[PDB]
């Protein structure tokens, strides 16, 4: 509904996606319908990006949460600089946090099992503050994203 553009809902989506990448999803009912749809499309994008950008992704050394945030914010600023927002660009935000969590799992100097909660936090901040209005105006996650991306 209209409130799915607020921080808690977005943070849960961002955290769910990292838990999918790390193979530690929440128990019970597990992820919502939105998360289930998002994880398939975001993962497909993630794999393509990892392949197509292999050479320039080898240059990055994500040694801490702070450097992950700095790189995330720099990349997002450049990706979104032209002011255009659409669902494909929103999906790439999730794909990119998946790349970052994988680099951290290998490169973080002071690894901490809560790290994915910190990464997904700054991802949610960006999505909410920079794309949340567009998301709301385009039907949110339920009436916008899921309607367009759920299976045919």
């Amino acid at each position: 509904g209209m409130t799915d553009c607020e921080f808690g809902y977005i943070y849960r989506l961002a955290q769910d996606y990292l838990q999918c990448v790390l193979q530690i999803p929440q128990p019970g009912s597990g992820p919502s319908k939105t998360s289930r749809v998002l994880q398939n499309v975001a993962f497909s994008v993630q794999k393509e990006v990892e392949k197509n950008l292999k050479s320039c992704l080898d240059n990055v050394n994500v040694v801490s949460v702070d450097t992950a945030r700095t790189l995330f914010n720099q990349v997002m600023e450049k990706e979104f600089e032209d002011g255009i927002i659409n669902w494909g660009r929103i999906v790439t935000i999730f794909a990119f946090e998946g790349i970052l969590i994988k680099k951290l799992l290998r490169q973080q100097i002071a690894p901490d099992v809560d790290t994915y909660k910190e990464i997904s936090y700054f991802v949610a901040e960006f999505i909410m503050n920079n794309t949340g209005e567009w998301i709301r105006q385009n039907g949110g996650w339920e009436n916008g994203f899921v309607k367009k991306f759920e299976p045919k």
């Binding site: 320039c56 990706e79 669902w87 660009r89």
Partner: peptide
């Protein structure tokens, strides 16, 4: 220099997604 390269790659991947669902 790779910050801009990554961002350009994400813009391209986003366009591929949009081309599919739209």
């Amino acid at each position: 220099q790779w910050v801009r390269e990554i961002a350009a790659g994400l813009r391209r991947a986003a366009d591929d997604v949009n081309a599919q669902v739209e």
